[PDB]
Design an enzyme around this catalytic site. Structure first.
Site, PDB file in Angstrom:
ATOM      1  N   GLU A   1       0.851  -1.429  -0.416  1.00  0.00           N
ATOM      2  CA  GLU A   1       0.179  -0.010  -0.310  1.00  0.00           C
ATOM      3  C   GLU A   1       1.254   0.529  -0.222  1.00  0.00           C
ATOM      4  OE1 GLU A   1      -4.170  -2.095  -0.134  1.00  0.00           O
ATOM      5  OE2 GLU A   1      -2.976   0.026  -0.737  1.00  0.00           O
TER       6      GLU A   1
ATOM      7  N   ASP B   1      -5.820   6.542  -5.206  1.00  0.00           N
ATOM      8  CA  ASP B   1      -5.748   4.892  -5.028  1.00  0.00           C
ATOM      9  C   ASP B   1      -5.708   4.986  -6.409  1.00  0.00           C
ATOM     10  OD1 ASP B   1      -8.546   3.134  -2.905  1.00  0.00           O
ATOM     11  OD2 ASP B   1      -8.409   4.583  -5.323  1.00  0.00           O
TER      12      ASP B   1
END
Ligand SMILES: *SCC1=CC(C)(C)N(O)C1(C)C
Length: 164
Positions: A11, A20
């Site tokens: 991540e 994202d």
């Protein structure tokens, strides 16, 4: 290696609101704020998550706090889900981490939809499971990360995260 180190690799860590892979505002270590296209909305979500008026910027400690909550939430989401819990219980701790990774990224409902893969995992047909896991929007949209998670399910080792 462990699930925190694994998801920190997959991540990243960014202290300012960013979009994202799906274009959604996020912060910290993969903490999704909102699917709203409104940045002010994302900031409102952020402020209530951390409990203060942020400028859209948090500290590393705050990011880590959200991350610990989110890993815990993924695990408890697995254990409350009738489809995921028996598979989780059937796995070794490394493969358990791979399943938490998937739920962290796509949510309990999305992972619980991988019915064929989940049966092959429960059957410990690891190469077959790996083949079926790749036949997914998940794999196609984030193939390098999905390959690492799939290699973890296939092998029960951390080899895909070694050197990373
Ligand atoms: S988060 C919901 C929201 C935030 C803001 C950008 C102030 N809005 O107008 C709505 C209520 C969409």
């Amino acid at each position: 290696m462990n699930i925190f180190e694994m998801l920190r690799i997959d991540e990243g860590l960014r202290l300012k609101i960013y979009k994202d892979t799906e274009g959604y505002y996020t912060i910290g270590i993969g903490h999704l704020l909102t699917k709203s296209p409104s940045l002010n909305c994302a900031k409102s979500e952020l402020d209530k998550a951390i409990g203060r008026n942020t400028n859209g910027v948090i500290t590393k400690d705050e990011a880590e706090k959200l991350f610990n909550q989110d890993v815990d939430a993924a695990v408890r989401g697995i254990l409350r889900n009738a489809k995921l819990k028996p598979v989780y219980d059937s796995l070794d701790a490394v493969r358990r981490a791979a399943l938490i990774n998937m739920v962290f990224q796509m949510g309990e409902t999305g992972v619980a939809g991988f019915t064929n893969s989940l049966r092959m995992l429960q059957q410990k047909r690891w190469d077959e499971a790996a083949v079926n896991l790749a036949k997914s929007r998940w794999y196609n949209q984030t193939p390098n990360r999905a390959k690492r998670v799939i290699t973890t399910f296939r092998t029960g080792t951390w080899d895909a995260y070694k050197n990373l």
